[PDB]
Subunit: 176 residues, 6 copies
């Protein structure tokens, strides 16, 4: 947790932490977004470290289901440190980072997000959810948002608050 | 198996459908998702993940020319849930139903799944290993599966699941919606 | 033949059968086309299972040499079943399928087409023409169109009518 | 060999030419085809198969700047007959002649073939293995072959075929058309 | 090492900066060059060689949103000198300084080098193997190196070189320009 | 030298010779350029045998630092004979060939150019400069332009005039 909190400027917006996997190892990674209005041509969508199309899908869901008006906004996204983010579980952190920059409201650098985001705005389960809460807890994170359907039949550790969520709107209201 | 899709399906959520696709020789159940919304400015946007961009374009042209859905002025975002790569003719029907579901604002039944190639004249053409697909659907608790009508000839159906043979995309939309 | 005739809706237009090769084995494949007028931007040309550029060439030849006005038409092409069509011999079937959709006139599902199409509208010879007429005959096709220059020095089987052609216009007049 | 091209060549068919190209160490005869027609709407279309798109663009700029053919407002479709992949400098001359033939509406002689790289100042530059190319052309019954004039120095010509050494693209167009 | 850059640097030449990057485990010194000039017609041009096109776009958006440089109406051409491929987060700071130098028409000191990843909120984030980078800079006679301020914790500095830990891109521009 | 001089038409403009490397062997290659005004859309930049982006950079430097107005000019570039030119040292020859076509003034086919060109118009050193002057001399070239900073500590052969240069403007004035 500490290496992310030292790198987070005070009240810096447009970033979020994800618990992702390299092989079978769980890794913490920071997702960053910068949204500003488009001037000419198509709205700019430039990414590094995460798929361009995945970001487009996430921005369409955020507009249609959470009302953020992103169609006329340029978006620049990146994963800190050059970590390749290529799995469904990173959707939520990417969505939160975008909303954070759009809302100009920061996230807490001791919290992290795990979940696939469907086109109906739902937060879908992901694999190896137990290592994710464990790695997030073990490295000193206080709160982790996960798909609530991933919580069924699981033993929560008390070191970290585990917030089960089901929709992107529900997440935005808790976080912002 | 089947309710893991019913537990992930929000109540009355539109624009999704289940396909029985194949990875090697193993049959896999996968959810196709679509988001069709009117274009505001510029050209209509078409973004996909997990399935071929051109295949979706072809399917949308068929749905317009043969099922009357006016998709040329609508943006379309499509994805396969869970990062499953959908790369075979058999997924055409599920993609088409997912698109029609989002366009019609009417949901599909999360205990039903769709299998079939879609031709440019709107016909549902046969696919390989239809038996494993119907079996996998029954195995995992699905109640109904739509399959190519010509795939049924000389085949043994499981008792657990209704198998509806279809021949045209319009016939599917009217039974489903 | 029968597996193609059962899949062909009654009077369904914009499709045709080709006798192509997988390695040294001759295979029957159905080519499909859908032509409708273009609205904005460039005329749409979307393909799967066959090369985009090959279709563009075929559509330019059909306009310049057979008068079909395709420059203001969108075209969607595909090979049924996901079969990759990647050889000169498929030109004729692709051209006929396009003309069938453009003319709104169907082809006979018991007939098939074999030939390379040149830029002057000519039907050029192809390799292993004998297996192609044989495989077409053996699987119950009644008629096959082939390059007439491929017929020189060959023994025709009586099970199938073999129509030697030399130009795309001559083919369109026989078929439509 | 040579008449297999003359038998496939419609009477007075324009926009084609023969090249002696190389696959590994074997020389192959191939027909280059061009279709040049005026643009109706939008930007001029350039579609190719069997030869590099950029190489055709370069050749068309040379033909315009050095041979006066106005190609900027013309669509061009090019292909190599038989699916032969043309990927070497020696094919430039045949491609240029095929383009000029379609533009001028004047045919080439199907018993003639062209070998040479085309420079941006319109010069015909030497190519490798000129002897196998001229020999293969004679072997297969061709009557005339145009080759780079500098490729002839110190070389033994076959008696069966006229070998015309050329130096500029304009010189070729005037001898050929 | 250091003067080979000072000997190649024209007097008062703007738009260049030195980075300590890594090839495998070996640290390499490389010069990043930028050419920022106002757009005359059409959309702003962005051409790069030796470094990722998207990385430069991201860096230019950060410099505009966080350092006030108006780059949306400026063409940008970027390259790494010597054909060195720059493909790691640590080069962000040098690229940003090179861009700001060309935009501000103010040169950098060719005996200084820059190391750091640049975040979208303008922060300078830590990089790997900071010790070899600072050591290689000293080894080759550089007088000053800017590094991520958080990379210094628990590290032994060489006496030969000033090590300036920085935290924001604005702080760097004001110290450097 | 002789094989390049025989292929050079009298007063033919827009070409130049470079001493490049295939592995560790030094090779002579001819770079060609053709610049004409752009009509519609973006100015045409078509290349073969050398990188498209490298040519764009070189044309931007030639405009900003030597005043040649190339932004409204189409450019076609190629290496003679299909030789792949993929190293910093070819910059100078490419720049000279473009300027030659733009200025409508030829280069001498017995001269060659070696050097990387920086964004400030400077001619930067290249590796194995000694083989380059040697191969240029051995094959009968009379003059070679090289980066002057490459000359420090080197023994010049008298068979060939070696012109050390530092800027693209200085080169253009000597050559044109």
């Amino acid at each position: 947790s500490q290496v992310f909190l030292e790198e987070r400027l005070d009240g810096a917006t447009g970033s979020s932490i994800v618990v992702t996997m390299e092989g079978t190892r769980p890794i913490l990674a920071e997702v960053q977004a910068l949204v500003t209005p488009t001037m000419f041509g198509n709205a700019k969508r430039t990414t590094t470290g995460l798929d361009f199309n995945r970001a487009s899908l996430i921005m369409a869901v955020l507009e249609k289901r959470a009302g953020l008006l992103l169609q006329n906004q340029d978006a620049y996204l990146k994963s800190a440190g050059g970590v390749k983010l290529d799995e469904p579980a990173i959707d939520l952190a990417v969505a939160v980072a975008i909303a954070s920059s759009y809302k100009d409201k920061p996230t807490n650098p001791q919290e992290c997000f795990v979940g696939e985001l469907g086109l109906t705005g739902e937060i879908r389960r992901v694999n190896r959810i137990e290592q994710r809460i464990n790695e997030a807890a073990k490295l000193g994170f206080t709160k982790i948002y996960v798909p609530k359907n991933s919580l069924t039949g699981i033993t929560l550790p008390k070191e970290i608050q585990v917030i089960g969520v089901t929709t992107i709107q529900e997440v935005l209201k808790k976080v912002f």
